[PDB]
Design a protein around this ligand. Structure first.
Ligand SMILES: Nc1ncnc2c1ncn2[C@@H]1O[C@H](COP(=O)(O)OP(=O)(O)O)[C@@H](O)[C@H]1O
Ligand SMILES: Nc1ncnc2c1ncn2[C@@H]1O[C@H](COP(=O)(O)OP(=O)(O)O)[C@@H](O)[C@H]1O
Ligand SMILES: [Mg+2]
Lengths: 52, 192, 191, 103, 94, 546, 49, 77
């Protein structure tokens, strides 16, 4: 629905979760999500600052 | 005297005045002997080239098996000596009228003319005889005995081009130089 | 239902012999005797076969009496041609009469000049084709623009004879039904 | 040969009644029947979702991006699709949130 | 309002034929209309001097009484002056 | 559009009367209604369609040539685009899908100019000055045909014609096939002018293995069955003589209107014998000539088959007229309509016979084909297409037939240009600077003419289901710098287009896609002449049938 | 099983309009442009009624 | 655009004059029907409130964005 190619946006987002929880605490890879408008690649700049 | 020939194909920009008399009909291509003619003598045939018969219906009987050999030989002989007189008069281009009532040509007559490299056409309108005769300077012919060289015209190039599907017969130049020449121009266009 | 009728209906006396080895003799020969009798009737009815170039006194007999025939209502169709040698369609129609005369011997083919037919006839209306039957005019046909005009063919003339009831639809002599031997040869091979 | 016996012992039930077993790929058809209106929901989820025109027989129009709402007006024939209508209707009544997801 | 909305939809026709999504076209107008409202506030004036007459002549355009504005505007301005502030009852102008 | 107009108010016409901008809008929707089926078929990303005849029969077709011919439209404004698709197939043989889209958009984009009170005479004048300026720019931007040490051109030309087809993936195999086919069937005419007769090669509808394993025949393949089954099927040895006859060889009656009449019944059997003997005397002299293979246009009766079976001659009936001219032209024989000469005698000379190396009858999925290979005088070629069914091969037949016309033009005219909407995007930058020079009202006509030319590269991206503005904006950026190239090669930012399989802008010369420039010339004029025909109409007068 | 016909179950009712494709939203724009054409010449003092 | 087409004037000469003359015609630059020319509207005493303009753009922007977020049409019965 965002006018992006799903074949490139979907597996780019899997890379954030294929790098699973290393030995360091306070991992911030959980807030990665899709983006409707903006930057390329798509993992959103967190859903954080966005407040959604 | 100013005939407007309509040919579907091409564009309007390709329209130009043809020097000689352009023919609308295409060639027969039943034999397909000659391809391109140069310095050809044009003749206008009004009679029909066929085996010997009057215009009315007839009855031919066969009382002996030897009569068929004379019939099959003499039928082509009537076509042969016509081609000899055509060869004696060195007439290279022939124009035959429509002639719905009597057969204009056949496979036998086309074969003898194929060896002599003589093109032939059909489906000529009766009203266009004034345009072809006055334009090309060729008097018509309606009898084989009165066929001679003085009644025939002349031309430098007589050919039939195939310009992207649109087939047209074109004549270039007339050496008779009669009193009042004629005009012929083909109209080309994308749409009919 | 039609598969049983096509064995006899769609085969002449020459074609019925194909089923001599396959079908029963009594079933086949019973119909061959019927079709043989029909062929004999056409031979007796073959009183014509060339164009009758007539003149007027005679018209009052040839054209009309004939149309009565036996008068058993043995009617006879009589195709008249008011010929005019100056017209191009008239000479075409004269050729069709002699061609059809050699085939359909039961139908009478009549020809006469149009100037000698009717007092001061319009030359523009010629050639004229009239069809008599039992003294009554079945068809007063006008010039051949209906039948193609200058491009009239033998197939168009035979089709007109079927419309006026002069020849049956499934007649083996008509060019529409008289398929070529090479045509039937290809059908048997591809069957 | 010209005509079948047309399903004998069919007078046990009325002519209008029909059975639909799992065989003959009918469960695949029920999944395909869901796929007809499910693709309508694809273009209606999210912030970039597109609303839908629904003209009723009375003429009252409602333009919307919400599943539970759009499925109220559409008269459905397939019973398996009506399970999604009442499932989304339960979602709207109880929580009032997340109806496209149910669909 | 109508000949303007149709032009925006007619202008959105070839973009929909292209691969432009629907939300991209709406984001442009919704972001541009915010500047148009602010720009119209700058085009408009804060006029208080000179104390109605001129505004009525333009509202009567495109119909019958525009040519007779010399007579109807003189008494039409007196219609609203009878009404006081903060009431503005429309049924009194029946 | 809104409602129907009044029917002959104080005009007294038996039919309908309409006028104003309503019919001008109906012509735009009419050209757009017939163009929508052509939109999805453009470019390699386009998909095919199927037309059902309401009798079960269907045919798969991609090109808009025969699709619009089959679609029976009753609106006469749409008939001009129907005939335009048929016209472009005759002369050029490629781009029927593009002229319909270009002609429709020129009318669609010019519809805005109508309600601006710009007259159509001024609009077409602005289009025509843009046309001849575009033709000269096309004549400047064209490239030579050498490009390297080797040829490296004709293999790439086939890929453009072969794209957007079912066998576009197999174009690498078929590219060598089409170039080897047309180089074999060349001829000589007009004292040095080389010609390439299209359709001279035989396209056979075979079924079997696959389109990838389609064997190219080094010679002509005749599609006909053998007469008798007891004949020899394979004829080996060199110098196989080919006889091409057309006269009537089966037993026929006498002259067309004569009647046989005889009084003496003794000679009734003799006349029957000579009618059966006169037809066998012709077959006797062919055996004396020693023709191993004989071909006849007409039928062959069983009276003639016994002599061919005995003497081991290959007699084939039911040949067609157009085929035997190519057999005689390839094998070196001459067409014989009848056996005669200038003399009164009747005979047959050995010079009439052709020559070939091998003749073999092959059968593949109920398709008997006589494979004639090794013509000594002149070479020939045939392509045996193989696929699923006959209706799928009709798309392949049209795909190959269009490929011959495109490869015909690049050899007749060596000038070519790249694909991917390169010249369509280059003319926009050239015409924008020219539109400002002319000054007056023709600026909008030349400008909107340029905007309509961009629809070709836009449709490639819309049908690809990708983002189109990014590719068009990048293609616009490179072409924008081409006019401002600042010559001193380093003249880059030209000869680029779209790459749809990857979605990038790369060099079309290295990618291996080209198209002849003459196709661009005739398509633009024929598209504009069709646009002139629709714009100049004001009012319609539809008369009902009596 | 209860009938030899086995009718295929349609999703929507009979008579329901068509659905997704090419030209759905364009028809709504052309429908608005059609209504917009009637109100087009009525603009300004030199218009019509 | 349409305001001048109904007046019978050519739109190209008008629309070319509006764009290139906004520098000296800062804000009160518009069409004049009486003199068949283009000039300042402040001298002609033609006025109009701003509330028509704000509600027109907001209603027109809301109208076009309503169905632009629609790609379906369902009509029962
Ligand atoms: N601006 C945005 N950026 C990223 N994700 C969003 C944004 N807006 C909505 N979403 C996501 O889209 C989803 C849509 O949920 P949805 O089912 O439409 O909610 P509702 O039940 O209100 O319809 C939400 O779960 C949310 O995570
Ligand atoms: N491989 C390709 N890459 C980019 N564009 C192509 C390619 N193949 C074809 N095209 C474009 O498609 C257009 C028309 O293609 P064409 O072969 O005429 O289609 P059709 O065979 O359906 O008529 C050409 O103008 C060309 O630019
Ligand atoms: Mg092509």
């Amino acid at each position: 629905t965002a006018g992006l190619d799903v074949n490139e946006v979907l597996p780019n987002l899997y890379a954030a979760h294929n790098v699973t929880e290393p030995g360091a605490v306070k991992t911030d890879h959980l807030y990665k999500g899709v983006d409707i408008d903006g930057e390329s690649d798509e993992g959103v700049k967190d859903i954080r600052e966005e407040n959604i | 005297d100013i005939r407007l020939v309509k040919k579907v194909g091409g564009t309007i920009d390709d329209t130009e005045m043809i020097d000689g008399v352009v023919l609308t009909q295409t060639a027969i291509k039943s034999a397909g002997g000659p391809t391109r003619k140069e310095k050809a003598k044009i003749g206008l045939i009004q009679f029909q080239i066929s085996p010997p018969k009057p215009d009315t219906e007839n009855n031919i009987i066969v009382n002996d098996y030897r009569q068929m050999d004379k019939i099959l030989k003499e039928e082509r002989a009537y076509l042969l000596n016509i081609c000899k007189k055509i060869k004696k008069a060195k007439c290279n281009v022939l124009l035959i009228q429509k002639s719905i009532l009597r057969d204009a040509v056949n496979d036998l007559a086309l074969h003898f003319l194929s060896k002599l490299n003589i093109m032939v056409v059909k489906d000529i309108e009766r009203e266009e005889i004034e345009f072809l005769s006055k334009g090309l300077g060729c008097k018509p012919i309606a009898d084989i005995e009165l066929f001679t060289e003085d009644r025939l015209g002349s031309a430098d190039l007589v050919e039939e081009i195939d310009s992207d599907g649109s087939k047209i017969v074109r004549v270039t130049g007339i050496r008779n130089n009669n009193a009042r020449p004629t005009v012929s121009v083909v109209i080309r266009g994308a749409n009919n | 239902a039609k598969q049983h009728e096509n064995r006899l209906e769609d085969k002449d006396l020459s074609d019925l012999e194909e089923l001599e080895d396959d079908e029963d003799e009594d079933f086949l020969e019973a119909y061959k005797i019927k079709r043989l009798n029909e062929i004999r009737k056409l031979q007796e009815r073959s009183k014509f076969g060339e164009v009758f170039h007539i003149n007027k006194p005679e018209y009052n007999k040839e054209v009309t009496l004939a149309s009565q025939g036996k008068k058993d209502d043995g009617g006879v169709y009589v195709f008249v041609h008011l010929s005019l040698q100056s017209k191009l369609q008239s000479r075409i129609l004269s050729h069709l009469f002699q061609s059809a005369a050699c085939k359909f011997r039961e139908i009478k083919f009549v020809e006469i000049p149009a100037n000698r037919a009717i007092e001061n006839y319009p030359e523009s209306n010629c050639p004229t084709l009239i069809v008599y039957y039992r003294g009554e005019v079945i068809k007063n046909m006008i010039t051949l623009l209906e039948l193609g005009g200058n491009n009239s063919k033998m197939e168009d003339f035979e089709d007109f004879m079927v419309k006026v009831g002069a020849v049956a639809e499934g007649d083996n002599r008509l060019i529409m039904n008289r398929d070529d031997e090479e045509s039937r040869e290809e059908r048997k091979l591809h069957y | 040969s010209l005509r079948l016996p047309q399903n004998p012992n069919a007078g046990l039930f009325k002519q209008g009644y029909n059975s639909y077993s799992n065989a003959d790929g009918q469960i695949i058809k029920s999944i395909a029947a869901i796929r007809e209106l499910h693709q309508m929901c694809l273009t209606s989820m999210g912030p970039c979702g597109r609303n839908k025109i629904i003209v009723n027989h009375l003429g009252k129009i409602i333009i919307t991006n919400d599943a539970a709402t759009m499925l109220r007006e559409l008269d459905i024939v397939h019973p398996a699709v009506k399970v999604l209508v009442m499932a989304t209707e339960q979602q709207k009544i109880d929580m009032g949130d997340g109806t496209n997801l149910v669909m | 309002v109508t000949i303007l909305a149709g032009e925006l939809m007619k202008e959105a026709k070839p973009f929909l034929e292209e691969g432009i999504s629907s939300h991209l076209i709406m984001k442009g107008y919704r972001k541009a209309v915010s500047l148009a409202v602010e720009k119209i506030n700058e085009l408009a004036v804060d006029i208080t001097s000179e104390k109605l007459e001129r505004c009525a002549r333009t509202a009567m355009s495109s119909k019958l009484i525009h040519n007779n504005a010399d007579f109807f505007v003189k008494m039409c301005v007196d219609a609203v002056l009878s009404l006081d502030r903060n009431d503005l009852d429309d049924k009194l102008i029946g | 559009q809104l409602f129907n107009n009044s029917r002959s108010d104080t005009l007294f016409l038996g039919g309908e009367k309409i006028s104003g901008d309503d019919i001008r809008n109906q012509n735009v929707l009419a050209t757009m209604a017939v163009a929508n089926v052509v939109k999805s078929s453009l470019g390699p990303v386009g998909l095919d369609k199927m037309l059902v005849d309401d009798i079960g029969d269907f045919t798969v077709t991609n090109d808009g040539a025969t699709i619009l011919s089959l679609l029976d439209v009753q609106h006469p404004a749409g008939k001009i685009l129907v005939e335009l698709a048929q016209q472009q197939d005759r002369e050029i043989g490629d781009g029927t899908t593009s002229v319909v889209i270009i002609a429709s958009e020129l009318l669609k984009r010019a519809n805005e100019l109508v309600k601006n009170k710009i007259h159509p005479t001024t609009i077409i004048t602005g289009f025509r000055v843009a046309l001849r300026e575009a033709i000269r720019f096309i004549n400047e931007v064209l490239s030579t045909s050498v490009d390297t040490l080797g040829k490296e051109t004709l293999i790439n030309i086939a890929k453009t014609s072969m794209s957007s087809k079912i066998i576009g993936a197999d174009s690498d195999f078929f590219s060598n096939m089409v170039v080897d086919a047309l180089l074999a069937v060349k001829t000589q005419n007009s004292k040095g002018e080389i010609k390439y007769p299209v359709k001279a090669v035989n396209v056979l509808k075979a079924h079997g293995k696959s389109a990838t394993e389609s064997l190219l025949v080094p010679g002509y393949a005749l599609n006909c069955t053998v007469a008798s089954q007891a004949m020899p099927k394979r004829i080996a040895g060199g110098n196989v003589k080919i006889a091409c006859l057309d006269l009537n060889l089966q037993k026929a009656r006498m002259a067309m209107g004569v009647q046989i009449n005889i009084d003496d019944p003794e000679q009734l059997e003799q006349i029957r014998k000579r009618e059966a003997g006169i037809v066998l005397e012709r077959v006797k002299k062919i055996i004396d000539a020693g023709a191993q293979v004989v071909l006849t246009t007409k039928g062959i009766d069983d009276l003639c088959l016994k002599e061919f079976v005995e003497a081991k001659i290959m007699g084939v009936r039911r040949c067609k007229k157009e085929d035997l001219r190519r057999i005689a032209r390839a094998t070196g024989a001459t067409l014989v309509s009848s056996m005669s000469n200038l003399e009164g005698e009747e005979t047959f000379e050995s010079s009439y016979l052709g020559l070939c190396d091998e003749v073999v009858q092959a059968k593949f999925s109920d398709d008997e084909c006589i494979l004639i290979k090794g013509t000594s005088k002149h070479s020939s070629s045939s392509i045996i297409l193989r696929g699923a069914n006959d209706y799928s091969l009709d798309e392949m037949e049209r795909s190959l037939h269009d490929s011959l016309s495109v490869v015909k033009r690049t050899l007749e005219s060596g000038n070519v240009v790249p694909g991917g909407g390169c010249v369509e995007a280059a003319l926009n930058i050239y015409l924008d600077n020219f539109a400002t020079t002319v000054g007056s009202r023709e600026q909008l006509a030349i400008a909107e003419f340029a905007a309509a030319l961009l629809i070709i590269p836009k449709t490639l991206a819309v049908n690809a289901a990708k983002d189109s503005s990014e590719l068009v904006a990048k293609l616009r950026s490179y072409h924008a710098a081409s006019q401002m190239a600042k010559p001193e090669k380093r003249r880059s930012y030209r000869n680029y287009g779209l790459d749809l399989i990857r979605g990038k802008i790369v060099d079309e010369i290295h990618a291996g896609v080209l198209e002849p420039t003459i196709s661009k010339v005739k398509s633009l004029k024929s598209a504009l002449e069709a646009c002139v025909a629709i714009l100049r109409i004001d009012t319609m007068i539809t008369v009902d049938p009596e | 099983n209860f009938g030899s016909q086995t009718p295929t179950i349609v999703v929507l009712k009979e008579g329901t309009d068509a659905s997704q494709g090419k030209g759905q939203i364009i028809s709504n724009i052309n429908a608005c442009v059609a209504v917009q054409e009637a109100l087009k010449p009525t603009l300004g003092p030199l218009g019509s009624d | 655009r349409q305001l001048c087409e109904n007046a019978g004037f050519d739109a190209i000469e008008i629309l070319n004059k509006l764009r290139l003359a906004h520098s000296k015609g800062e804000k009160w630059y518009g069409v004049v029907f009486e003199t068949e020319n283009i000039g300042d509207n402040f001298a002609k005493f033609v006025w109009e409130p701003a509330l028509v303009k704000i509600n027109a753009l907001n209603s027109a922007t809301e109208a076009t964005n309503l169905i632009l977020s629609v790609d379906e049409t369902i009509t029962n019965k």
